[PDB]
Design a protein around this ligand. Structure first.
Ligand SMILES: CCCCCCCCCCCCCCCCCC(=O)OC[C@H](COP(=O)([O-])OCC(O)COP(=O)([O-])OC[C@@H](COC(=O)CCCCCCCCCCCCCCCCC)OC(=O)CCCCCCCCCCCCCCCCC)OC(=O)CCCCCCCCCCCCCCCCC
Ligand SMILES: CCCCCCCCCCCCCCCCCC(=O)OC[C@H](COP(=O)(O)OCCN)OC(=O)CCCCCCCCCCCCCCCCC
Ligand SMILES: CCCCCCCCCCCCCCCCCC(=O)OC[C@H](COP(=O)(O)OCCN)OC(=O)CCCCCCCCCCCCCCCCC
Ligand SMILES: CCCCCCCCCCCCCCCCCC(=O)OC[C@H](COP(=O)(O)OCCN)OC(=O)CCCCCCCCCCCCCCCCC
Ligand SMILES: CCCCCCCCCCCCCCCCCC(=O)OC[C@H](COP(=O)(O)OCCN)OC(=O)CCCCCCCCCCCCCCCCC
Ligand SMILES: CCCCCCCCCCCCCCCCCC(=O)OC[C@H](COP(=O)(O)OCCN)OC(=O)CCCCCCCCCCCCCCCCC
Ligand SMILES: CCCCCCCCCCCCCCCCCC(=O)OC[C@H](COP(=O)(O)OCCN)OC(=O)CCCCCCCCCCCCCCCCC
Ligand SMILES: Nc1ncnc2c1ncn2[C@@H]1O[C@H](COP(=O)(O)OP(=O)(O)O)[C@@H](O)[C@H]1O
Lengths: 163, 344, 139, 120, 105, 97, 319, 54
């Protein structure tokens, strides 16, 4: 539809509300994995195939998975029934509708119109994300170096903490 | 620490503030802040004592959420101006976020709860770095953006800090926390003049660094985290009793010593700008800070507390000396006042 | 916000009702904020206990707000002199006294009276002399 | 403040323009103070390290009195410049924007009538 | 910035990409490349305090090249109007809405 | 986008309220903390994409790379805590009082 | 002095360690002819034999090494310990606290020799074994309960940092036979000591010291007869396998920090001076100032080693 | 008037006013949740301080 993004945006807020009610450590991981799926989709909507898939590849299964992993190792003591949380969550599901509603009557609005892909070359190539992300190696080679040191000194920071 | 790791970490703890200061693309300023967060956490848990893990886990959560808030400000700006950096046009709320966030990393005012607690569980050494080479980074970001921040908020965080710092300090007896509290206070003065004359913030900082760095290397010379512990200074090492006395009164604003200049010129600049309401209240409770400074003076110098018999044993053995920095930073700090005009 | 400001617009000693209402609100607002910090830190034992504390702090603060407003307005009315720090001091004097009572302490009333009244008086002077608080940088 | 000035040297200590200013006399009271400030640092060090206060490190005493002083001449040389820039900048503005800083005529007391409060 | 080790060293690791009009890869100019230029060649040599009042035409425009909100209000208003009229049939879906009208290359 | 950009921003505030209102397990917090980084990553990517500002796409990822390590440090502290107490409840972290 | 510079450039303890390089303590009752065994074992493996810690062991350690006056050395008398048990002034606790500080200095000096030269260490009784005297003292009226807590607090604060004895030797002779051993040695203060107090000392070892250390280190129990036969005991030490114990994890980069600690005596006993004010331990400001303002005026002590001209130091004007 | 009334009013009272104020501000659980919430309150008030003085 035209509200291709809004609906999704709404789902992203629902997942964030789930993480915010701080549900059981791994039941909510799912929540993230859900909104990460959702955010992966929105970016794709705007044409960021690479940037999008990237999230589905790194935060989704790399970061998040490792997160729950550790949950299992510790902090998954799985000792308030999440169902109570789901009860509240349901409240917010529509409570947010309230927040939107005021501005809904106030109304941009009426779903989502041309509030996406503002300008795109009706002709032409090389217009695609991943050409921009690959500026790490031409004209933006300082972001690349500092990220390196993050991960690189990350190794040394982690082991030192672990030890 | 495998000396290699020591190098990588220390480099990061030092590349962290330096990238922040040098770059203009805010993003690069954010990652400078991010590195500092990552580099400091390993050192904080070096003893790995149960208190330490608590310290780092607090420092990290407080630092991390603030880092995320600073990033949100940069992300929002990017959509209100394509630029990756704050400009005259910036929405006021965008800047206020940056003030709150950066005032959390620096630990000013109503966000002053983490610092006293992390200063209590970390070693005296890493205490210094956590107090003085980690304040340079955020302050740089603020000083750069001063023209745009709000005069009202800063002042409120300034005044609050002064009060919280002072009041907190009065009760504390642990030295690490007395210093943590002082830093909150001095940090307050610094952020008070930022909107008006940033150049004075950089003086009220250096002087704080030239005052606190000698003070802590003094606390650790005898590694005393208690006033009772520093009070037996007269037996362990008598000479530092004289300068410890002046440096602490210098940390508070008493007039002959170097410490008056930062307060004096900040008050002169605020009165020049007409805040004779705000400046007056700050100076007054600033006087509360000296009370707890002098109470320590009493215990350590003006009165001689009783010592244990084993203290004679520690005297016998040659006392490992205090680095030269102590002297050069004790004198340049206790008495440079005759040279104020050129400092400002 | 156009509201609170109204307090200042009408000459002092006049329209006490509005004055007292506004002053009462400010105190009450402070009450809420104060209770909030008091509950967030130094938490309570039961939700109700804390709801009570919020109430206690709110009312006490609302009271100090009212008497300040009422006393200052009336003192000015009865005295017929609209511009006088003394009006406010009497008001602040009273406000402190309410705080003292709520805290059931004559001593607090002492410090309360002096300190609180002095502060309020200074507010009057501040307004009379056009003192500027939290000023914009004009260097 | 003074940063953002035209021609600002982005990272330089003292721009050559500061050559035009007189050099600080080596015996300027201030540099001499820095000297004493230094000697004291030295003496203090000896004391904290428990050495004969004055008769020890006579080499160090020199390093100190001579490090501080060296620093001074080159610092004061700059701070002097900074202040000098301040006038160049200040005086210039007074002129470029003359109307805002107008010369005022002060009536001889004969004319002005300040009221007289008697002490009695 | 606070310590300009970049200008001094002449390096430009952080300045080349701060605004939308900076060199975009493959010279694919972004939206507004026109305005931001007009709003920063204006505010060059004039400090901010005076890049904020007189160079307000170029920001008021660049604030609408990118937010593109005043447009919305126009279009959204237009939309409503159509709706009301159409409901009473006052207005009919244009030939465009009817499609055809010779969609051409 | 203007509409959506709101949802993401409130997502970040709902994630903000989460990390500033702890409850038992820390791993929940760190998890919440990450919810923000996702919201920031999504918003940065979205505007960069509709501004056709390709010179800035590097950032959306630099944000994630730094955020990942940031989280790595966070979890190692967490593992350190349930090794010293073994229950990972923000509740026992009070020795420093 | 040793520093990370030295560690970075060679100077690693690991490459200086050899089989004969261990921390071996021999502990016994007041009279176990322990001294001989140690010097004997020492002679066997060339181990630096450290003598039993003394009141003036620290003074022999520092500067001139001439014995200090009693008040300069903390005013402790083992002699008065015995003739006046449960004394009003508490010389017995002050004696014990100074003794713990002395062995802390001795153990640290021993570890410094071990990690630097690599020669193994024999120090007789250790800090770990010191507690038996206090346990027995509290068992009788010698020390009160808090006094015990103050020693335990100092022990908990300082002893864990130092690595455990590699092996411990136990030269045991029965409660009655040590008292006859006491009877013939000449001092009269050692004589007339409580049989029950000696009972409490050896009992405290058997009940607590040997089992505790039986995992932390290779305890080698020896009866008197095995003793007086250094050869046999020495043989057995060379026989035990130095495996079980915390010493296994001491990598070079870990030893460096331990070395830098023992290298700093002022820290070794930093927690020995903790400001806990039990009455026996307290110097007192007026007496303490006089004792310090007097100890500091002794020749060669006024200034740091190398700088006091009284004893003949020179080159002070360039040091 | 000397001793008690002129020492209880000016010199001593100021002693007490503060002493009591430090006792309330420094009696903190040390728990992170409490402290953090207070950060929440602050964000809220500052959000408003900007809002009302828009
Ligand atoms: C003793 C050692 C002396 C070595 C002498 C070596 C030979 C030498 O220098 O003689 C030639 C040389 C020739 O001097 P000159 O320039 O021809 O003198 C004419 C000047 O106009 C005369 O000088 P001037 O007045 O033009 O100098 C400008 C400025 C010069 O400024 C200064 O140099 C200040 C020096 C302060 C000492 O004046 C001030 O002093 C303003 C500051 C006044 C004090 C402000 C601070 C007061 C509160 C704090 C007091 C100090 C507290 C210290 C901290 C607490 C310590 C426990 O003499 C000197 O320069 C030294 C004069 C004495 C300096 C201070 C010595 C102490
Ligand atoms: C003026 C400014 C005022 C700002 C707000 C101040 C609020 C009062 C602060 C002090 C409150 C009194 C102290 C005790 C509060 C408390 O206990 O709640 C914490 C809450 C519940 O979780 P837990 O920590 O387990 O507490 C259970 C207690 N039996 O822990 C949580 O709530 C965790 C987060 C989940 C809920 C929020 C999730 C986001 C969505 C919120 C939707 C709206 C919710 C409105 C409530
Ligand atoms: C503007 C004026 C500001 C105030 C100036 C006057 C106050 C100076 C600061 C004093 C602060 C400490 C007060 C208490 C000190 C106690 C000292 C003490 O207890 O004695 C021991 C101490 C160290 O001993 P040691 O030198 O090792 O040998 C003796 C061993 N018993 O013995 C020592 O420490 C000896 C060395 C002490 C320091 C000497 C300082 C002399 C006075 C300096 C006056 C400066 C006046 C400047 C005037 C400027 C005018 C413009
Ligand atoms: C005509 C004379 C008019 C005098 C007006 C001022 C005094 C009025 C006193 C009324 C009675 C107040 C009183 O009795 O309470 C004293 C107050 C609380 O005392 P507390 O220890 O709580 O015990 C009280 C038990 N009923 O303790 C206090 O805090 C008293 C504070 C007010 C003191 C007023 C007198 C001060 C004199 C200062 C003189 C300086 C020179
Ligand atoms: C008009 C004349 C005004 C005169 C003002 C005099 C101020 C100093 C009077 C004496 C204050 C004092 O002695 O402070 C003590 C107080 C408690 O600390 P302690 O000294 O341990 O307890 C003794 C209690 N008498 O210590 C404290 O709690 C702080 C005491 C006040 C210190 C200065 C505060 C200035 C605040 C300005 C706002
Ligand atoms: C500068 C010089 C100022 C000189 C002012 C002199 C006033 C003298 C008044 C008479 C003496 C009163 C007194 O000293 O009481 C101290 C009081 C004793 O305790 P109590 O009153 O029983 O209540 C305990 C509350 N924690 O201790 C307390 O009650 C402390 C808590 C109450 C504080 C009351 C003052 C609050 C001021 C708010 C000002 C807001 C603006
Ligand atoms: C600012 C200068 C004044 C500072 C004190 C203001 C009042 C703080 C307060 O009332 O908190 C009380 C709380 C302890 O509560 P409790 O022990 O119940 O005390 C009641 C005693 N009858 O004590 C605490 O919880 C700690 C202190 C709470 C206040 C922290 C700082 C509050 C700052 C308020 C303005 C913030 C502006 C932020 C702008 C962005
Ligand atoms: N902690 C202590 N408290 C009291 N006395 C101690 C303590 N440690 C050692 N001693 C004294 O050491 C003496 C035993 O030493 P001894 O066996 O004579 O030395 P050697 O090894 O030269 O034979 C005992 O008489 C005992 O009083």
């Amino acid at each position: 539809m035209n509200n291709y993004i809004f609906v999704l945006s709404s789902l992203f807020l629902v997942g964030c509300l789930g993480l915010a009610l701080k549900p059981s450590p791994i039941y909510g991981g799912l929540g993230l994995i859900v909104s990460g799926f959702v955010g992966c989709l929105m970016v794709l909507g705007f044409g960021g195939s690479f940037l999008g898939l990237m999230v589905f590849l790194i935060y989704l299964g790399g970061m998040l998975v490792v997160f729950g992993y550790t949950t299992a190792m510790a902090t998954e003591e799985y000792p308030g029934s999440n169902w109570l949380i789901l009860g509240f969550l349901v409240l917010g599901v529509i409570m947010e509708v309230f927040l939107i509603c005021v501005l809904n009557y106030y109304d941009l609005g009426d779903g989502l119109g041309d509030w996406l892909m503002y300008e795109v070359d009706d002709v032409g190539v090389m217009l695609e994300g991943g050409i921009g992300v690959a500026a790490m190696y031409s004209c933006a080679t300082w972001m690349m170096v500092v990220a390196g040191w993050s991960l690189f000194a990350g190794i040394f920071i982690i082991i030192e903490i672990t030890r | 620490m495998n000396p290699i790791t020591l190098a990588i970490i220390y480099f990061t703890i030092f590349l962290g503030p330096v990238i922040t200061m040098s770059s203009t693309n805010l993003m690069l300023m954010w990652v400078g802040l991010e590195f500092s967060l990552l580099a400091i956490i390993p050192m904080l848990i070096n003893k790995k004592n149960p208190r330490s893990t608590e310290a780092a886990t607090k420092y990290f959560v407080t630092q991390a959420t603030a880092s995320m808030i600073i990033l949100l400000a940069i992300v929002l700006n990017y959509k209100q101006l394509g630029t990756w950096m704050f400009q005259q046009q910036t929405n006021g709320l965008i800047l206020n976020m940056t003030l709150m966030a950066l005032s959390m990393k620096l630990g000013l005012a109503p966000f002053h709860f983490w610092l006293p607690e992390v200063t209590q569980g970390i070693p005296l050494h890493m205490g210094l770095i956590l107090l003085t080479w980690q304040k340079i980074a955020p302050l740089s970001i603020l000083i750069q953006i001063y023209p745009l921040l709000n005069s009202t908020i800063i002042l409120m965080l300034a005044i609050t800090s002064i009060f919280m710092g002072a009041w907190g300090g009065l009760n504390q007896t642990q030295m690490r926390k007395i210093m943590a509290y002082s830093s909150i206070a001095h940090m307050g003065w610094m952020l008070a003049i930022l909107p008006y004359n940033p150049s004075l913030t950089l003086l009220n900082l250096m002087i704080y660094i030239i005052l606190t760095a000698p003070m802590f290397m003094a606390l650790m010379l005898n590694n005393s985290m208690t006033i009772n512990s520093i009070s037996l200074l007269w037996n362990k090492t008598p000479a530092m009793l004289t300068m410890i006395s002046l440096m602490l009164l210098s940390l508070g604003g008493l007039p002959p010593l170097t410490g008056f200049l930062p307060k004096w010129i900040i008050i002169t600049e605020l009165m020049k700008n007409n805040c004779l309401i705000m400046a007056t209240l700050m100076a007054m409770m600033a006087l509360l800070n000296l009370f707890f400074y002098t109470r320590l003076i009493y215990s350590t110098s003006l009165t001689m507390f009783p010592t244990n018999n084993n203290s004679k044993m520690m005297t016998h053995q040659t006392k490992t000396k205090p680095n030269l920095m102590f002297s050069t930073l004790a004198i340049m700090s206790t008495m440079t006042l005759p040279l104020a005009p050129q400092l400002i | 916000k156009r509201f609170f400001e109204s307090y200042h617009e009408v000459p002092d000693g006049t329209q006490c009702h509005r004055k007292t209402y506004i002053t009462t609100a400010l105190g009450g607002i402070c009450g809420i904020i104060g209770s909030a910090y008091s509950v967030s830190l130094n938490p309570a034992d039961s939700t109700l206990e804390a709801v009570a504390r919020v109430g206690r702090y709110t009312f006490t603060a609302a009271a100090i707000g009212a008497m300040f407003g009422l006393t200052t307005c009336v003192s000015a009315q009865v005295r017929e002199k609209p511009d006088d720090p003394l009006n406010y001091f009497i008001g602040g004097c009273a406000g402190g006294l309410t705080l003292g009572a709520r805290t059931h302490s004559y001593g607090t009333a002492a410090m309360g009276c002096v300190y609180m009244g002095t502060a309020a008086a200074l507010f009057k002077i501040g307004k009379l002399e056009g003192w500027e608080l939290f000023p914009t940088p004009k260097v | 403040m003074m940063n953002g000035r035209p021609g600002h040297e982005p990272l330089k200590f003292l721009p050559d323009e500061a050559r035009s200013l007189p050099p600080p006399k080596l015996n300027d009271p201030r540099l001499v103070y820095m000297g004493l400030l230094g000697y004291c640092t030295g003496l203090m060090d000896n004391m904290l390290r428990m050495r004969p206060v004055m008769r020890a490190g006579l080499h160090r005493q020199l390093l100190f009195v001579t490090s501080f002083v060296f620093a001074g001449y080159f610092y004061l040389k700059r701070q002097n410049y900074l202040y000098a820039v301040k006038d160049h900048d200040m005086f210039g503005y007074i002129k470029l924007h003359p109307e805002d800083f107008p010369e005022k005529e002060k009536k001889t007391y004969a004319e002005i009538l300040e009221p007289f409060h008697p002490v009695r | 910035p606070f310590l300009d080790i970049q200008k001094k060293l002449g390096i430009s690791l952080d300045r080349h990409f701060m605004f939308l009009s900076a060199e975009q890869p493959y010279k694919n100019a972004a939206r507004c490349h026109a305005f931001e230029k007009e709003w920063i060649e204006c505010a060059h040599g004039i400090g901010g305090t005076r890049a904020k009042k007189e160079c307000k035409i170029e920001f008021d425009d660049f604030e609408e090249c990118l937010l593109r909100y005043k447009t919305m209000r126009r279009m959204h208003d237009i939309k409503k109007q159509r709706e009301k009229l159409m409901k009473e049939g006052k207005y009919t879906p244009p030939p465009h809405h009817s499609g055809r009208e010779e969609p051409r290359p | 986008m203007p509409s959506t950009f709101f949802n993401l921003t409130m997502a970040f505030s709902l994630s903000l309220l989460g990390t500033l209102m702890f409850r038992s397990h820390l791993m929940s917090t760190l998890l919440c903390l990450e919810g923000m980084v996702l919201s920031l990553f999504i918003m940065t990517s979205v505007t960069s994409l509709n501004s056709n500002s390709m010179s800035s796409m590097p950032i959306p990822i630099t944000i994630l790379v730094f955020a990942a390590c940031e989280a790595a440090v966070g979890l190692a502290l967490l593992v350190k805590v349930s090794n010293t107490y073994g229950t990972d409840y923000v509740q026992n972290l009070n020795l420093l009082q | 002095r040793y520093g990370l510079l030295a560690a970075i450039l060679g100077d690693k303890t690991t490459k200086k360690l050899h089989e004969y390089s261990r921390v071996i303590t021999v502990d016994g009752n007041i009279c176990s002819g322990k001294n001989k065994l140690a010097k004997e074992i020492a002679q066997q493996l060339g181990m630096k034999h450290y003598p039993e810690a003394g009141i003036q062991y620290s003074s022999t350690t520092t500067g001139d090494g001439r014995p200090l006056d009693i008040e300069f050395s903390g005013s402790c008398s083992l002699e008065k310990f015995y003739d006046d048990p449960k004394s009003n002034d508490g010389n017995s606790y002050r004696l014990q606290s100074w003794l713990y500080a002395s062995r802390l200095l001795q153990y640290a000096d021993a570890l410094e020799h071990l990690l630097s030269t690599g020669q193994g260490v024999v120090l007789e009784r250790s800090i770990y074994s010191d507690f038996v005297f206090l346990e027995a003292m509290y068992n009788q009226g010698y020390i009160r309960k808090q006094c015990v807590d103050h020693y335990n607090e100092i022990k908990r604060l300082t002893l864990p940092e130092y690595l455990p004895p590699h092996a411990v030797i136990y030269i045991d002779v029965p409660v009655p036979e040590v008292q006859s051993r006491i009877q013939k040695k000449g001092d009269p203060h050692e004589m007339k000591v409580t049989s029950a107090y000696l009972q409490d000392i050896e009992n405290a070892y058997k009940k607590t010291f040997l089992p505790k250390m039986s995992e932390m280190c290779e305890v080698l129990v020896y009866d008197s007869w095995e003793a007086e036969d250094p050869t046999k005991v020495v043989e057995d030490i060379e026989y035990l396998k130095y495996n079980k114990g915390p010493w296994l994890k001491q990598d070079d980069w870990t030893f460096h920090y331990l070395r830098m600690l023992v290298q700093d005596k002022t820290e070794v006993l930093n927690y020995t001076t903790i400001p806990v004010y039990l009455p026996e331990i307290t110097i007192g400001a007026h007496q303490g100032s006089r004792i310090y303002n007097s100890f500091r005026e002794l020749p060669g002590r006024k200034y740091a080693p190398g700088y006091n001209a009284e004893v003949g130091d020179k080159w002070i004007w360039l040091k | 008037l000397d001793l008690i009334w002129l020492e209880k009013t000016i010199p001593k009272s100021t002693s007490t006013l503060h002493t009591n104020m430090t006792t309330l501000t420094t009696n903190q659980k040390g728990l992170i949740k409490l402290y953090f919430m207070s950060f929440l309150i602050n964000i809220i008030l500052i959000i408003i301080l900007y809002s009302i003085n828009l």
